[PDB]
């Protein structure tokens, strides 16, 4: 499966978890396969951009993701998530590689 996480600099897979969700300036699209990170990309998040906003959710999606693990996000965007199938874990806290690896040793 994908899965994305909001990151607040580019370390590739030691890119930080960002604070916040939809104004983070990049999204992490983890595949993982036999239950391991298999391969990161680490992408700008077009509505990081200053007075360009909007469907958030929606563009992590369309890139694929079935879950998303933040530290912060607001209730309008994990309605959006659950309203299109997309399961949303919170609070989590690390680099992108260790927040996947927790999620994927059920940590």
């Known amino acids: 499966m994908?899965?994305?996480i909001p990151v607040s600099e580019n370390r590739g897979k030691d890119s930080p978890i960002s604070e916040h969700?939809?104004?983070?300036?990049?999204?992490?699209?983890?595949?993982?396969?036999?239950?391991?990170?298999?391969?990161?990309?680490?992408?700008?998040?077009p509505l990081a951009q200053d007075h360009v906003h909007g469907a958030v959710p929606n563009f992590v999606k369309e890139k694929g993701?079935?879950?998303v693990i933040v530290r912060g996000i607001g209730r309008r965007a994990i309605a959006a998530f659950e309203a299109m199938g997309?399961?949303?874990?919170?609070?989590?806290?690390?680099?992108?590689?260790?927040?996947?690896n927790q999620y994927l040793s059920g940590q």
């Open 65 to 67: 993701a079935e879950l």
């Open 86 to 100: 997309v399961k949303v874990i919170k609070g989590a806290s690390g680099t992108v590689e260790e927040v996947v």
């Open 21 to 45: 969700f939809g104004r983070a300036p990049y999204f992490a699209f983890v595949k993982v396969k036999n239950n391991a990170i298999a391969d990161i990309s680490v992408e700008e998040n």
């Open 2 to 4: 994908i899965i994305a």
